[PDB]
Amino acid sequence: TVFSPDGHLLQVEHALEAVKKGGCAVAIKSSNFAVLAVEKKNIPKLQNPKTTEKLIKLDEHNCLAFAGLNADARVLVNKTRLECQRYYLNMDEPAPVDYIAKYVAKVQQKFTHRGGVRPFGIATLIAGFKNNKEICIYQTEPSGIYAAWKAQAIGKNAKIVQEFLEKNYQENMEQKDCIFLALKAIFEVVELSSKNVEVALLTEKDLTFIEEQEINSMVELIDQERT
Amino acid sequence: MYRNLYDTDNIIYSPEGRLYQVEYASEAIKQGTCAVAIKSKDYVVVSGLKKCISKLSFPQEKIFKIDDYIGISMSGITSDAKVLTKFMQNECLSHKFLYNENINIESLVRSVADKYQKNTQKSSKRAFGVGLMIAAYHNEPCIFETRPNGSYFEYDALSFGARSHASKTYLEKNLHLFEECSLEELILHCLKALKCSLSSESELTISNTALAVVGKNHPWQEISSLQLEEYLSKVK
Amino acid sequence: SRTTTFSPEGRLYQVEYALEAINNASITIGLITKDGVILGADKVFISKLIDKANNYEKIYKIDKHIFCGVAGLNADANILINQSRLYAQRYLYNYNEVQPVSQLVVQICDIKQSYTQYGGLRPYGVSFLIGGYDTKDGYQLYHTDPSGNYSGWFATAIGTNNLTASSVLKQEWKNDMTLEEGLLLALKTLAKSTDTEIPKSEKIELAYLTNKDGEVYQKYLTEKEIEELIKLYTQKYIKE
Amino acid sequence: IKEEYNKFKYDITKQAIESLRERIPKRIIFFNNLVNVNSEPGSILNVNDLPSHKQIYLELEKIKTYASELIEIIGNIKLWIQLNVPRIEDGNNFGVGIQEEAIQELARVEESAFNLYDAIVKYYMERAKISTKVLKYPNVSDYQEAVRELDEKEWIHIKITIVDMRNNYIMLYDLLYKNWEKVVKPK
Amino acid sequence: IKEEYNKFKYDITKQAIESLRERIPKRIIFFNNLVNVNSEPGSILNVNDLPSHKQIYLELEKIKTYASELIEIIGNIKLWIQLNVPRIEDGNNFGVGIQEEAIQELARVEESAFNLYDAIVKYYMERAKISTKVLKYPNVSDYQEAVRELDEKEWIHIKITIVDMRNNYIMLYDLLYKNWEKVVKP
Amino acid sequence: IKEEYNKFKYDITKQAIESLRERIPKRIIFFNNLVNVNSEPGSILNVNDLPSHKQIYLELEKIKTYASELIEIIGNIKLWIQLNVPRIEDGNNFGVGIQEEAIQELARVEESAFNLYDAIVKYYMERAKISTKVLKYPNVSDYQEAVRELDEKEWIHIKITIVDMRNNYIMLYDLLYKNWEKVVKPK
Amino acid sequence: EYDRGVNTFSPEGRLFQVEYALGAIKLGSTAVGICVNDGVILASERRISSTLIEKDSVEKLLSIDDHIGCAMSGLMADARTLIDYARVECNHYKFIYNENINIKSCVELISELALDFSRPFGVALLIGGVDKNGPCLWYTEPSGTNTRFSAASIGSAQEGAELLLQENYKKDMTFEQAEILALTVLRQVMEDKLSTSNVEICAIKKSDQTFYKYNTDDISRIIDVLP
């Protein structure tokens, strides 16, 4: 990996563009919880659970929904879950989300600076807890940059979904209201299939999923809101 | 088939017989500022001209210090010159620790010139493009200098790339420095070299020309910021 | 260029050619039944001078309860089998129990993923249908690629003519399938993929797990599939 | 003036989408209705339906209409592609390469339709010179055969122009459609 | 309008496949019966079987028919591959090269047949021009020989054209048959 | 002498900025108002409104005025870029290629507009030559038809120059605007 | 055109891979630091264009130690690696020697890490502090040239701020004198208004010998003086 004659990096901008051809994933912060959202696709009558392709855990309080290369997340998560547990062994405290995000960003940065190593073509977003009872959703890019957010989205056509989220983002919301805002982000997959969107409600330091039963009760209301 | 094949690698040789990658480093020292040293009978003075990049900036240092009786003055890139300074500092200080006598000058430059040699045969590491200027005094004041290829020349006066040709010609006809035992005439003779070899219509020496002396009862005493502009930077 | 470099489109080159290199290899069929997972194969015949009675290089054995049907470079397939047999045994040496296949494909796709990321070496032109039985979630059938993006399945038809053979399992497959009915189901898709109507029986090989609380995992002989081939004649579970 | 110029860039974008979604598909079917792809071999490029040749004249008049409408449509489209190329930079300019290939093909088709205007002038000039020789040398029969063959030549060229027209129209729409995301965004 | 456009896409694909399965093999056998490969040397390209030359005239008319049918067949086949070119990408585009090679080979044969109509005009124009000179200079005997050699030249040119037709038809079919899996789904 | 030269360098810089911010945009709107992009196909580049043909003469005369204004404006701009080329050095000169590319395209447009004068002399010469053939051979109708057909071609050719005029101005302006920092300060 | 190797020279006596990164530092956010006789004052922008950001996770003025503050420019993902290295060696110096490190001894080690012969670090800093001998301000480059500056500027708009400081710097300027001066140069080159959120000044006083980030409340009383 070397520079460019004007000043860019041909090995990083290529990798940053590689995450654009991947399933979209949107996260949203709240008062004392942070619901996540992801939109995947599967072949019908085959591939029953999609081996939990998104919404990976790292600890009891640190969810992670990546986007991009599905095969390159295993090495990224296994090199993270190990560090999330190693921190607990050396500091006797569950790893804060500020440290995990600072570690995932250092992992991708350690792969572009070195030579003869392909960069991690994967952009993620980590939603967890800080040392105090707080919740700050982070977001890391393959270049190595990272910053917290109140809402963020990555994946295929992430600009049009992040732009919509920039307008109707309220300050503090309700558990169902915050889900509806994340469920109003089906602006990537046409017809809003219930077998495509997957959300998890990370609350009270204990992650949990969201059953498809209440999904249909919320995904059907969007069709009766465009008129 | 020529002019572009034998140019970018430190391993290939030209069909004529010239290592053109190392030859660029010898020319890379010419883009730096000028420097000049005078070897008298018992003293050695080094005149170095700094380079103020901007009005708000400060002139970067040119003349350094290695030991009490050993001080160098780089001329080239600050990237590799600083590395050779640390290698020369850890080497001479180890000699005063492993033994008690001071380090021999020629036995020191032999280690520094060897550092250029180790960074010339390997394909990965490039050559240090920097023209060193080692001025010291142990028993007879000698002045040594290196190039990207391993070399030593017990010079009596030198110049370094800015207006070296205008400065070399002044030293070629000024060979009375050996009998100019008076330090005052030496520093005026050394500063006269820069004054007659500076750029056109530039400021002569407005406290931006580093000066250092070394001799019999003189350690590497950097010329203070007051002793030069009182009479040395005022004679011309 | 090398595998370390990316492409302006975002895809890769070495892992993309390997995905196409397995398309020129023989087909393999995966199938989960209500009794045990079964597999299919296609012995490519360079000539009629092979043994054809004792061996077959399309379905191997990983452990006493985990078995895969390889498809791709037969040369590079032997390394991963020699690498998966160690992980299937190092887990037993470290935890005194059988290894779940969900924890095996992760242990084996990472060895592929590690090649398409550094080292400057070529990737593994191999992809296989690995299935087995476990106490945690019953029978399973996973499927790896040269990139490492594994995924669970019910029926897969990688090798040559995948899209045609996979469509057969979209309709003819049922949620409830017995062992004998599943074999006949997987026998037709193995034959019509090669644009033929009946297998020559000096061809395709099948395997099946069907844990009878001991994981028998019996393979098939050239005479045992004759009865299966004869049953296809009467009851034809046709192309459609 | 600043408003009128910005209005023009807006005015271009409108015209381009209108041409690709309606004007171009309509012409594809139009030219196809004159020379259907499903015709059997030899039923198109023949001479069975054949002073100056008034029949060829009438066919050329329709051609000139077809030539005019083609050049006008592509020209704003060509300019429109030009308006979307980003600032020239070193590296990560894969999209300008896609853009340049599209501009190249548009100019090629334009040269093809443009050459019809010059080719029609050549027909009348060349035919007249040989005919003068027929008047001067009425028994050398090859001059009269040359006249006959020239009409058969021009008749074939007229139809080959229409098929190439037809095939280019679908090829232009299909080409832009596949690379549409790089056609609209600059980089 | 959306329906009419999609309907066209169905009609082209049929015509291309139809030409390779029936139209192209039939012409292979057709041209071979006129210029058999098993003929002894000199028995094809000869002048043994030889105002305007009415005998030469009838054969060129047949040539124009052969030329017309070739351009019509190749033109839809050429168009069909063009609709099958995938989106342009950097790398892993070996299949577009076959397509590029295919358009080049199809266009080469097409341009060759296309130039015969202009070439036939050149024959009559040149023969008529020399004939005018014969009227002006009736005793210079090489002009009478000139009439003979031009006809022999055109007769040879006619026959080299028919073998090239035959040879082009087989080279196109043989190339597509061997590379059949890669031409449709590159 | 030193003063007049330095005065010249100032005079160039003024003229260059003045031309791009005012002189060039006003002419863009001017030519666009003559050939509006929103016209439906075939209504501009047609021949519906069509001794020598005095009517055709006035249209060619307008082109030469337009041609004059184009060559003069671009020529000083080209010189300005040339005076802005940095000293030739090895490496980090991707931008000089961009500068060179701008000069290359600018010279191309200049040469293109320059060729109308050569194209216009050829028109009168060919039309006069064909007319001699009509007087010598008054019954071969294709010579009279060639003259008629010639007028329709030249009328179109006049109009194609105007569309290319319009489109070249935009291609030049868009390129310079986006690459403004490197043409002035290539570093 | 010689661009394959990383350590290739030039026939004119110049480097190539280092010079590529010389233009890469001219794309980051602008910054400006003034070294006065009483201390060092820094300033920077805050490109938080998207309002969904937390606005505190992204910072341009990190801290090397409690006595040395610095700025950043260029590749933000690589700038953190050098700052993390400076935070180690400066702290490692305090463990060996009880006194705080000198900037002349700290900038020389922050420059030697940009001499990896990987790739050169495309980042320029504005390391400043009040270590000893009064306050000093240094400006490093990827080439390794460490030039002590009295008032400099790094960023995409560093050209305009260069000539402004030359016509405004006076040696007898106090903290409050330069604090307004540290904002008038930012008011010139700015595509926004100098609000209480886009500016993130901080200073190191000579008295307490420690740095103190000027919060949102303290900067409001300085941005309203209208220079």
DSSP string, E160-181: HHHHHHHHHHHHHHHHHHHTHH
Chain A interface residues facing chain F, Cβ-Cβ under 8 Å?
5-6
Chain-centre distance of CA C80, in angstroms? 13
F141-178 and D94-136 helices, crossing angle to 10°: 170
Interface contact flag, E51 D140, Cβ < 8 Å: yes
How far lies A12's CA from each of A9, B185, E92, F139, in Å? 5, 61, 21, 76
Q: Hey, what amino acid is at C94?
A: N
Q: Residue A162 corresponds to which tokens in the numbers above? A: 């992040």
Contacts of D94 (CB under 8 A, 6+ apart): C8, C9, D182, E90
Please give the residue of chain G at the shortest CA–CA distance from B51: G147
Residues in chain A with CB shorter than 8 Å from the CB of F186 are none
Q: G6, G15, G20, G81: best mutation site toward chain A, by most A Cβ within 10 Å?
A: G20
Q: Are strands G31-36 and B70-72 parallel, antiparallel or unpaired?
A: unpaired
What's the number of domains chain D is made of?
A: 1
Q: How many C/D residue pairs have CB atoms within 8 Å?
A: 3
Q: Is F92 on the interface with A (CB under 8 A)?
A: yes
Domains belonging to chain G, first-starting first, are 1-227 (3.60.20.10)
The SS3 assignment for B214 reads strand
Which backbone phi and psi does E124 adopt, to 5 degrees? -65, -40
* DSSP class of B43: E
Find, among A135, A148, A152, the residue nearest to A206 by Cα: A135
Residue C145 distance to chain A (closest CA, Å):
9
Beta-carbon contacts of A169 under 8 Å, excluding residues fewer than 6 positions away, are A28, A150, A151, A181, G52
The CATH superfamily assigned to C1-240 is: Aminohydrolase, N-terminal nucleophile (Ntn) domain (3.60.20.10)
d(CA B70, CA B89): 10
- φ, ψ of residue B66 to 5 degrees: the values are -115, -50
With CB atoms and an 8 Å threshold, state whether D174 touches E12.
no
Q: In whole angstroms, what is the distance from residue E7 CA to residue G215 CA? A: 68
For residue B59, what are its two tokens? 């002139």
β-strand pairing of B43-49 with B70-72: unpaired
CA gap B53, B37 in Å, rounded: 24
Angle between helices G158-166 and G175-188 in degrees, nearest 10: 140
Establish, for the pair of chains A and F, how many residue pairs have beta carbons separated by less than 8 Å.
Answer: 4
Contacts of residue E79 in chain D, CB cutoff 8 Å? 37, 167, 170-171
Number of domains present in the structure of chain A = 1
Lookup: tokens for F158: 């006049």
> Is-contact C71 C28, C-beta < 8 A?
yes
d(CA E80, CA D174) in angstroms, rounded, equals 12
- Is A126 strand, coil or helix? strand
Taking a C-beta distance cutoff of 8 angstroms, is the pair E57, E111 a contact? no
Are E91 and C17 within 8 A, CB to CB? no
Instruction: Inspect the interface and report whether the beta carbons of G16 and F89 lie closer than 8 Å.
Output: no
Write down the residue that tokens 């203070």 correspond to.
B224
CA-based torsion, D103, D107, D113, D117: positive or negative? positive
C-beta of residue G138 within 8 angstroms of C-beta of residue G15:
no
Give residue G186's identity as a one-letter amino acid code: L
Contacts of E52 (CB under 8 A, 6+ apart): D141, D142, D144, D145, E124
Write the residues followed by a gap in chain G (C–N more than 2.5 A): 117
Cβ contact C26:C159 at 8 Å: yes
F26/D8 Cβ within 8 A = no
The C-alpha atoms of residue C130 and residue C59 are separated, in whole angstroms, by 10
What whole-number distance in Å separates Cα of residue B27 and Cα of residue E156?
72
* Chains in touch with C (≥3 Cβ pairs < 8 A): A, D, E
Angle (CA) A112 A118 A121, round 5°: 85
Enclosing domain of residue F93: 1-187
d(CA A120, CA A116): 13
Residue A26 in contact with residue A161, Cβ under 8 Å?
Answer: yes
E131 neighbourhood in chain D, CB within 8 Å: 137, 140, 142
A107-136 residues touching G, CB cutoff 8 A: 109, 112-115, 136
Quote the minimal CA–CA distance from F91 to chain G in Å. Answer: 6
**How distant is the Cα of C7 from the closest Cα of chain E, in angstroms?**
7
Contact E9, E83 (CB under 8 A): yes
Q: How far is CA G73 from CA F37, G23, G110, G143, in A?
A: 46, 11, 15, 15
For chain C, how big is the Rg over CA atoms in Å? 18
Q: Within an 8 Å CB–CB cutoff, is residue F33 touching chain A?
A: no
Beta-strand relationship, A25-29 and C66-72:
unpaired
Give the Cα separation of B192 and B188 in Å (integer): 6
For C207, phi then psi, to 5°, come to -140, 160
Structure-determination approach:
cryo-EM
> D57: which 2 tokens?
């004249």
Domain housing A154: 1-227
The resolution in Å comes to 3.8
Q: Which amino acid is at B88?
A: M
Residue G42 near residue G69 (C-beta atoms within 8 A): yes
Q: Tell the residue number behind the tokens 């992801």, with chain if given.
A: A38
Residue type, D183: V
Range list of β-strands (E), F18-161:
none
The single residue listed with the structure tokens 């192309």 is C239
Virtual torsion, Cα F19, F22, F23, F24, nearest 10 deg: 80
- A55, A15 Cβ separation under 8 angstroms: no
Q: At B157, is the secondary structure helix, strand, or coil? A: strand
Q: Are B34 and B197 in contact (CB under 8 A)?
A: yes
Assigned fold of B1-236: Glutamine Phosphoribosylpyrophosphate, subunit 1, domain 1 (3.60.20)
Tokens matching residue G217: 């409340």
How far apart CA G86 and CA G59 sit, in angstroms, is 17
In sequence order, the β-bridge partners of residue C59 are C69
**For residues C44 and C26, is the Cβ–Cβ distance under 8 A?**
yes
The answer to whether the CB atoms of B24 and G115 lie below 8 A apart is no
Q: Which residues of D156-172 are buried (b: 16+ CB within 10 A; e: fewer)?
A: bbbbbbbbbbbbbbbbb
Residue C231, classified by CB atoms within 10 Å of its CB into exposed (0-12), middle (13-18) or buried (19+), is middle
Count how many residues are written for chain E: 186
Contact C110 A75 (CB under 8 A): yes
Q: Do E127 and D142 touch (CB under 8 A)?
A: yes
Distance CA D86, CA D100 (A): 12
Q: Please choose, from the candidates G163, G103, G181, the residue with its C-alpha nearest in 3D space to the C-alpha of residue G139.
A: G103
CA distance A203 to A185: 21
Reported as half-sphere exposure (CB side, CA atoms, 13 A), residue G127 has a value of 32
In Å, the largest CA–CA distance within chain B is: 61
Both tokens of G225, joined, read 């003086």
Give the separation between CA G30 and CA G44, rounded to whole angstroms. Answer: 6
Q: Is D94 an 8 Å CB contact of chain C?
A: yes
The C-alpha of D124 sits at a distance from chain F's nearest C-alpha, in angstroms, of 5
Other residues' Cβ atoms within 10 Å of the Cβ of residue C168: 23
Report the Cα B144 to chain-centroid distance in Å: 8
